[PDB]
Amino acid sequence: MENFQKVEKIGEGTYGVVYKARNKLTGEVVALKKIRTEGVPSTAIREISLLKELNHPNIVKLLDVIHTENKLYLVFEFLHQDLKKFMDASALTGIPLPLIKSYLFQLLQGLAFCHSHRVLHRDLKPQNLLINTEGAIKLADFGLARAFGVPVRTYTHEVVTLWYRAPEILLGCKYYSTAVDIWSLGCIFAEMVTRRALFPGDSEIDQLFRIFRTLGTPDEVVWPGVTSMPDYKPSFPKWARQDFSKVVPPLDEDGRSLLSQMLHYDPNKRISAKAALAHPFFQDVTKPVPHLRL
Ligand SMILES: Nc1nc(N)nc(-c2cc(Cl)ccc2O)n1
């Protein structure tokens, strides 16, 4: 629109491109996300519009939802850096454990809030976690899959990230629960610690098998009902579980314990965001300021 002075294209999301823009009249700098374009479910605009009510320190504020020329634009408060960029910038030294701990605590607070309001993210990844100079971290792009439905790609020949997808999704479950966000966050937690993606699959089956090779091929003992899932194949190789100590070295036992609960196969056994906040790992949590190069 002509209401802005578009600073630059910010990035490509699963549901659309994001832009940094300034209001010509108010001068406020915001993030503008453009969704796909033959109509779009109107029941979805209602659901998305409801998200404007969400207010929490760890959720990026949704300022406006605009429907024009059959396009959907989401106007969000702007943050200067995403966690993927920050992790890449911190690859030589690594993110200090106290900062990793602070970020995980805040993200769980954000998820606990959304989940208590029956809002799921469903596509959590480093790219949609944003940080500022004051040590805060916030989740952006909640509830798009629930309102619109996860399509095939972003909008134009894009390589979707499968790395943070929960096993029940990869196995074809039709109904998702808030547990899918805890899984994604667990994967991100591991990544901040080791400075390498935990399950970097290059295909849906490679994604699934990388999880199996690490946590062990699931069975009815650890995950009742798994052999009945839509995409389950009795022909899946049976890999034995690896020690966690090999998974995220050199994370201490409190951290490893918490991560293992975030990565349980059974969505029912997987820890909730609220319960995770009470885990001993957070007994000494603080709020460090990051070294951000903007
Ligand atoms: N990649 C990237 N980088 C920056 N600096 N900001 C964003 C961003 C994305 C959304 Cl959806 C909402 C607000 C934002 O600030 N995304």
Curated annotation (Swiss-Prot):
Changing residue 41 to L: In a glioblastoma multiforme sample; somatic mutation. Binds 2 Mg(2+) ions. The modification N-acetylmethionine is found at residue 1. GO terms for cellular component: Cajal body; centrosome; chromosome, telomeric region; condensed chromosome; cyclin A1-CDK2 complex; cyclin A2-CDK2 complex; cyclin E1-CDK2 complex; cyclin E2-CDK2 complex. GO terms for biological process: cell division; cellular response to nitric oxide; cellular senescence; centriole replication; centrosome duplication; chromatin remodeling; DNA repair; DNA replication. InterPro entries: CDK, Kinase-like_dom_sf, Prot_kinase_dom, Protein_kinase_ATP_BS, Ser/Thr_kinase_AS. The active site is at residue 123. Phosphorylated at Thr-156 by CDK7 in a CAK complex. Phosphorylation at Thr-156 promotes kinase activity, whereas phosphorylation at Tyr-15 by WEE1 reduces slightly kinase activity. Phosphorylated on Thr-14 and Tyr-15 during S and G2 phases before being dephosphorylated by CDC25A. The modification Phosphotyrosine is found at residues 15, 19. Changing residue 15 to F: 2-fold increase in activity. Pfam families: Pkinase (PF00069). Induction: Induced transiently by TGFB1 at an early phase of TGFB1-mediated apoptosis. It catalyses: L-seryl-[protein] + ATP = O-phospho-L-seryl-[protein] + ADP + H(+); L-threonyl-[protein] + ATP = O-phospho-L-threonyl-[protein] + ADP + H(+). Its cofactor is Mg(2+). Changing residue 14 to A: 2-fold increase in activity. It is found in: Cytoplasm, Cytoskeleton, Microtubule organizing center, Centrosome; Nucleus, Cajal body; Cytoplasm; Endosome. ATP binds at residues 10-18, 33, 77-79, 82, 125-128, 141. Residues 4-282 form the Protein kinase domain. The modification N6-acetyllysine is found at residue 6. Mg(2+) binds at residues 128, 141. PANTHER family: CELL DIVISION PROTEIN KINASE, CYCLIN-DEPENDENT KINASE 2. Serine/threonine-protein kinase involved in the control of the cell cycle; essential for meiosis, but dispensable for mitosis. Phosphorylates CABLES1, CTNNB1, CDK2AP2, ERCC6, NBN, USP37, p53/TP53, NPM1, CDK7, RB1, BRCA2, MYC, NPAT, EZH2. Triggers duplication of centrosomes and DNA. Found in a complex with CABLES1, CCNA1 and CCNE1. Interacts with CABLES1. Interacts with UHRF2. Part of a complex consisting of UHRF2, CDK2 and CCNE1. Interacts with the Speedy/Ringo proteins SPDYA and SPDYC. Interaction with SPDYA promotes kinase activation via a conformation change that alleviates obstruction of the substrate-binding cleft by the T-loop. Found in a complex with both SPDYA and CDKN1B/KIP1. Binds to RB1 and CDK7. This is Cyclin-dependent kinase 2. It comes from Homo sapiens (Human). The lineage of its organism: Eukaryota, Metazoa, Chordata, Craniata, Vertebrata. The gene is CDK2.
